[PDB]
Amino acid sequence: ETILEVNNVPTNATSLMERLRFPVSAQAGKGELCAVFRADPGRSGPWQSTLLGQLCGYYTQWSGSLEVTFMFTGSFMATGKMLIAYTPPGGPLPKDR
Amino acid sequence: SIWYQTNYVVPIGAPNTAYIIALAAAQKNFTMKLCKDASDILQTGTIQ
Amino acid sequence: GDRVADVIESSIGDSVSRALTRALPAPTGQDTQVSSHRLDTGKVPALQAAEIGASSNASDESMIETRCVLNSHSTAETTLDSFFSRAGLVGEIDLPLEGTTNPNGYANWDIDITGYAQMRRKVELFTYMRFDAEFTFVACTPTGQVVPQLLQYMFVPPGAPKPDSRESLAWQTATNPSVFVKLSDPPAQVSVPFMSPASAYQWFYDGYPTFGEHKQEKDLEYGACPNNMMGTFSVRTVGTSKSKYPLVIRIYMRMKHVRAWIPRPMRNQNYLFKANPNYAGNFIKPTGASRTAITTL
Amino acid sequence: GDRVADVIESSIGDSVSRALTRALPAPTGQDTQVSSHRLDTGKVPALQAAEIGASSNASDESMIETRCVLNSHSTAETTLDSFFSRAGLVGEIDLPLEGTTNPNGYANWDIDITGYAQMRRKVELFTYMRFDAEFTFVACTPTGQVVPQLLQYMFVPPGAPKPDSRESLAWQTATNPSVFVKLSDPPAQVSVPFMSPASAYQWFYDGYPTFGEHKQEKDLEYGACPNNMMGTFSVRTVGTSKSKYPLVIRIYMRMKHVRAWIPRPMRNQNYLFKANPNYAGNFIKPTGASRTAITTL
Amino acid sequence: EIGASSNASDESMIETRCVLNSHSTAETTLDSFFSRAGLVGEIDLPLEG
Amino acid sequence: SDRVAQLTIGNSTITTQEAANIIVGYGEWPSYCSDSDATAVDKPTRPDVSVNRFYTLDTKLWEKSSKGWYWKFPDVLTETGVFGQNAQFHYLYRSGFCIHVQCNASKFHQGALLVAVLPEYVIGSVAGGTGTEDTHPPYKQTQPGADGFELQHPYVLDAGIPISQLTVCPHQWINLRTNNCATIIVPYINALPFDSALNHCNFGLLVVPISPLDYDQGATPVIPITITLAPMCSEFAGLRQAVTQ
Amino acid sequence: SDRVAQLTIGNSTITTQEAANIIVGYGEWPSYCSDSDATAVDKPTRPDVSVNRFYTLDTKLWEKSSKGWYWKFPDVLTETGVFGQNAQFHYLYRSGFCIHVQCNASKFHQGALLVAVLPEYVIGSVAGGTGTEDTHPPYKQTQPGADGFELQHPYVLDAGIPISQLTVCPHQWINLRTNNCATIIVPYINALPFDSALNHCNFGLLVVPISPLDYDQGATPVIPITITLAPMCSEFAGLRQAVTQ
Amino acid sequence: SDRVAQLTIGNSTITTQEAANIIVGYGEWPSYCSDSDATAVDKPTRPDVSVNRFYTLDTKLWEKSSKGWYWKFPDVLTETGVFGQNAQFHYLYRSGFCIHVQCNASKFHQGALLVAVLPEYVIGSVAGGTGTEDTHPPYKQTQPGADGFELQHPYVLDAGIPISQLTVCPHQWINLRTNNCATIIVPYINALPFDSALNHCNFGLLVVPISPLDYDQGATPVIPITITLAPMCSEFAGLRQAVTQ
Ligand SMILES: CCCCCCCCCCCCC/C=C/[C@H](O)[C@H](N)CO
Numbered sequence A: 001e002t003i004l005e006v007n008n009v010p011t012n013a014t015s016l017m018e019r020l021r022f023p024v025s026a027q028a029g030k031g032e033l034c035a036v037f038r039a040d041p042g043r044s045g046p047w048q049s050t051l052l053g054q055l056c057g058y059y060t061q062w063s064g065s066l067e068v069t070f071m072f073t074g075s076f077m078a079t080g081k082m083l084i085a086y087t088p089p090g091g092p093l094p095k096d097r
Numbered sequence B: 001s002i003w004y005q006t007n008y009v010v011p012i013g014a015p016n017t018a019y020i021i022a023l024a025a026a027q028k029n030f031t032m033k034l035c036k037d038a039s040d041i042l043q044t045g046t047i048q
Numbered sequence C, D: 001g002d003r004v005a006d007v008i009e010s011s012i013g014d015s016v017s018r019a020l021t022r023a024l025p026a027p028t029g030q031d032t033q034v035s036s037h038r039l040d041t042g043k044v045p046a047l048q049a050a051e052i053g054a055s056s057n058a059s060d061e062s063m064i065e066t067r068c069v070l071n072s073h074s075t076a077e078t079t080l081d082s083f084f085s086r087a088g089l090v091g092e093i094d095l096p097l098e099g100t101t102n103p104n105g106y107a108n109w110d111i112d113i114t115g116y117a118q119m120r121r122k123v124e125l126f127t128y129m130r131f132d133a134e135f136t137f138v139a140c141t142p143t144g145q146v147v148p149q150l151l152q153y154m155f156v157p158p159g160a161p162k163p164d165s166r167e168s169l170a171w172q173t174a175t176n177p178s179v180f181v182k183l184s185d186p187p188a189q190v191s192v193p194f195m196s197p198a199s200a201y202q203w204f205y206d207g208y209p210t211f212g213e214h215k216q217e218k219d220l221e222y223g224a225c226p227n228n229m230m231g232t233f234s235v236r237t238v239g240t241s242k243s244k245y246p247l248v249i250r251i252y253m254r255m256k257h258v259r260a261w262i263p264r265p266m267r268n269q270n271y272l273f274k275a276n277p278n279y280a281g282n283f284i285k286p287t288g289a290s291r292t293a294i295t296t297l
Numbered sequence E: 001e002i003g004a005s006s007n008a009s010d011e012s013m014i015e016t017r018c019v020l021n022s023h024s025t026a027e028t029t030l031d032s033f034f035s036r037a038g039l040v041g042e043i044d045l046p047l048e049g
Numbered sequence F, G, H: 001s002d003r004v005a006q007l008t009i010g011n012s013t014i015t016t017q018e019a020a021n022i023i024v025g026y027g028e029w030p031s032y033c034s035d036s037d038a039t040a041v042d043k044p045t046r047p048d049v050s051v052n053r054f055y056t057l058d059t060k061l062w063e064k065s066s067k068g069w070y071w072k073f074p075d076v077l078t079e080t081g082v083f084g085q086n087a088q089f090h091y092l093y094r095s096g097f098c099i100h101v102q103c104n105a106s107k108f109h110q111g112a113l114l115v116a117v118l119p120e121y122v123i124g125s126v127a128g129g130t131g132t133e134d135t136h137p138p139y140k141q142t143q144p145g146a147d148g149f150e151l152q153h154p155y156v157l158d159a160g161i162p163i164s165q166l167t168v169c170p171h172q173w174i175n176l177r178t179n180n181c182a183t184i185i186v187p188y189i190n191a192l193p194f195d196s197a198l199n200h201c202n203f204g205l206l207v208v209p210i211s212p213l214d215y216d217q218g219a220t221p222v223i224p225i226t227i228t229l230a231p232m233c234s235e236f237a238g239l240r241q242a243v244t245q
């Protein structure tokens, strides 16, 4: 496992460190969207920060299931439930939960 | 895609915003084929 | 578990492909057995029905009085490897000194064997082909003269950085396979494996590679198979300055270990575009020659 | 056949209903065993979790010091047949001389046991009930006097022609079962089987019987179960002329061979309509009595 | 948190079929990855320089 | 060993770290219809993984003054995914269910939810208050869809039945102090081996807060309740053109 | 014993009294994907009877001047019934087919239809006639749908391939003098164990009249051609939200 | 059974009640040099309990804007106790390590530390920003001592290597919500059986907060990070007069 730059929006040097993690907060409870990213490891994007993606950049063809683990860094008293969904190829970005 | 199932519930006296760290890896059936050149060349001029 | 009859007796999951036919060895052509005059009723080999869609199985013995001929004519030369394992031109690379095509001393050739009808008509006979490849690169000046020039042939798989100049950093070939030969040397010859993600190359792909609306700008994506995009071929003159000689490079491909599936009708119209079955609409010509009348030769 | 693992090892078709519980005989109440003072840590029968949704299984012995009591109290009278096999009023038929309801000397009573709360509250305790029926018809004048009048009770199954007059042709009862008794005779009593198309009567049907738009005119179809429409009850005074005496007929039903499924909360509001769980919205009363304060009795 | 990669498999998360994976892992070995000649040094021998 | 649980079915997985065990409705797991109970002669279709998966249908906000909500089954899925498509194309229906209600809060929140499954939950009207009016609930109330419906008088469950006796049905309690999820597995409950998935609602799920939600000002005021459910051993029969309602 | 036949699959039955035997495409019956050939790890759904049934999609009128028509598979069923719903909800696709073309006439009518199945039938454009224009066929021509498409130049099949060699593919002849139906059973023909049912068309069915229809004036002038087909051993995988195109 | 742990070595004992298991660097326990791997002929000294003990070297304060810190081994102990005396008097060095990072907070604090061990962690300079200046890090930065050193650009770890791939090295996470300690056991990592304990730094320990520390105003604002470590199977050889640097 290596840190996946899901929140790869920033570009300035003083905030390059916040690309490693993305935030969650109290919401309105309507099943809003938190983050999206493509599942291609050797494609330009979040997966370039991973050692898996860097190595797959050296190989044209890959085959096998990938695994993504999200670590919650909130306080011990903070709870909540999140839905993480993988959309197989062919379907566009889901409009809602 | 990551969606809020219910909400992020926090009591009084704890931070209202929390961060999530995503770690990515491959399973045991992952294989690679057709070794190719690197897509990025970490070099601008001659390495002096 | 399974307690209902429709599940217990279900044939779901039977992955064996019931094949009504089995391959039988046939080293030589079939022998002809003795036949005699046959005058009987009810049974008739001559009358068949092409209506069914099966080729008529009437033999020589069942139609005319035949002798006994031991046919020893071998069928080896009509096999797939015998038919296809002959090198033929598939691509040509021009490296001019002053020109508009490749004046930079390098040229990127997208690997595709559809650029020449001689090879294309043969390969296009089958829908799916699985084979190895052997590529030979014959390089010479436009006058056919050999010159002491050192070249580099680079195999650039899909996704690898395409060189943009003769001194580009991509030529360091730290991972890509490269061949360094001189024109005075015999033509460079390498063996290329079956690199398609699919189990077999498909020359015709009746579909689109990506979802979405296929408008006018996104209309060239029809018939393009990413499973056949084996990569790019990059060639350059090994040097910092411009080469002294103009070069033209011809690439000959020879398939081996060939396997083929799904025969289709052979092309009968002039080819117009790479990876495109387009034909001249107003210039549709008949497959064969014509004659003035049907009752005369 | 089955060759793929996901089909061979599939549990599809397993029609056995895995039941975590099995019925055990219990002719009498459970005995109470000797218990003594118990002072230990880690193990605690008193603390439970109603959170799970299961009734607490703490026993008398695990809470207080108990003696040995051999409980011989029989549990026979709380069984389904013991509780339900008691005849009770389910329908009343009025046969007046001069009136607006049934001045024709006959009356058609659609068979339904929801017309009287005494019976309805008992039967409505369970969602599905399967039973036989025994119907007794007590007929008398409004003064309670018995008169020499001969009556005909006809069972009219759903689809059979409903009589429209005292001399209608439907009374020929050539196929329908009919009972001819006099008021001086003991009340007529017959046994009725389980005639529902379903495997059990359902007092609550959360659905509609037919497809289509359920507008205002087609709005009474909610909650009506055709599988409970057992037919119509037709009664008439056997004669061509008008009867001399006014009659009121009370029909008592007594279930037997009762089977019940899916217990539900018992009704706690006044009934308003047959085959309708409607309740007085503004007059919702508490299930039990109230008291001035919680700290006093 | 422990620092070990999660060992959850496909079978333990979603309903999977039986797939006989015959994809070879030979090309990702050290010699397969590294035994490809690449430029490491360049020497210039000019006439006037 | 009883507080952490993971339910996986089809291609969906639901986890929980503060579970309160699992209730099997009437002590019976969902199962396919036996050949001695089936009455239709056509071979039923069993799409399996394409329909037996966890559907997250809607999210309701729990408030200090909420009365409660109820959903009808399989109405909630008559218009959702491959399951809804099969229910529309097929006349007959048979399946179990696995209902997982999510309601998570902090250790400083309090409140109790009663999550129960009431078969053949027939909704009645208020009969015009006095009871002299023979009204019927509208289509949007008898078949609320995926949005559910808010109870008007949760004490009688809008059906003249006290909620105090609702625990006789398969039920679980979501008491925010201990557990944040309720899992109920409900087999097929009907008097028929098969029934229409559009006209007939086999059972209704009730989520009624018995103890009102409370918290001091400053804590997270939005406490959502999310219903997640997965049909089990779904069968379909009597295929014809699709029917929308 | 060979002229009368009855094909039953799912809940549909097709009969014929003037059949001309049955052609199994490349001598191979449709079969489910073996575990040594499958590459997707998720368990595929096999709806069986709900999708493996005879669909009557459209009727084309044969005329004395008709050029021919072609249909694309499984495009013709991407928007038909439970099969279309499954193809929309699932990314992967695998099935065989059983194509039954109906074309009935009297004993005084004459004409011959060539019914063939050409895998990966890529349609090309006329390239502006002269061939200097790099055109591509429109979406309505590459994916005609259930209406099929009329060939412009049936001699080259609008793809530069002579129809005289089309008989190398699995084919049957509908010669009105003898038979009024053609039955072709086509297994899954692709280089992949699974493929998208929307983007990729595995094969195209061609119905081209080689001998023109003829009849004396007075006979029935409307000779319809009806295509009836039934997927065999259909599998689906990679479920997500529905995708219309 | 996995959250409570006690590490005892030498005459020092370290306990923990919110541990997160123990990471053995590269799955290999520290061990003495085998006679087939040793190259020096003199008999090495193995002081055992006098050097194999937990040293608490310094305490760093974690702040909401901290960038991270790193320590070099065995530089941190070159000037500490009997271990430092032996490292100064002996030319050769060989030992493993057991690094225990302490960072304790309350249940209302949040933040995540990445504690990793990177062998041969060579520190580079910023090369004057543009990269045209061939600078080298000073002695106080390449060998920071027991005070460690604060990273300037933790994203590249001041060495041009992304921290996102740092987890490939033996590492543990101190996420204040669950655990307050990270234990890493590192064997001897070098290309030589012995090496100088002063000139060569076998590995560098990195403590970089990936998720910033946060807490509402009023809680304890001082959250210290304390490094405790114990050499394992320490050997020394080549005795001479003491050398200070
Ligand atoms: C020195 C390196 C040479 C590498 C040679 C790789 C050749 C691979 C053999 C097959 C190449 C694809 C041939 C063309 C396929 C299809 O017809 C076209 N892509 C149509 O789109």
Ligand SMILES: CCCCCCCCCCCCC/C=C/[C@H](O)[C@H](N)CO
Binding pocket: D111, D112, D113, D114, D133, D135, D153, D154, D155, D190, D192, D195, D201, D202, D203, D223, D224, D225, D228, D229, D230, D233, D275
């Ligand atoms: C002399 C002939 C008498 C025939 C007696 C037939 C009685 C059959 C027993 C069950 C009758 C149905 C009772 C009512 C069922 C439901 O509650 C209502 N139909 C509600 O719609």
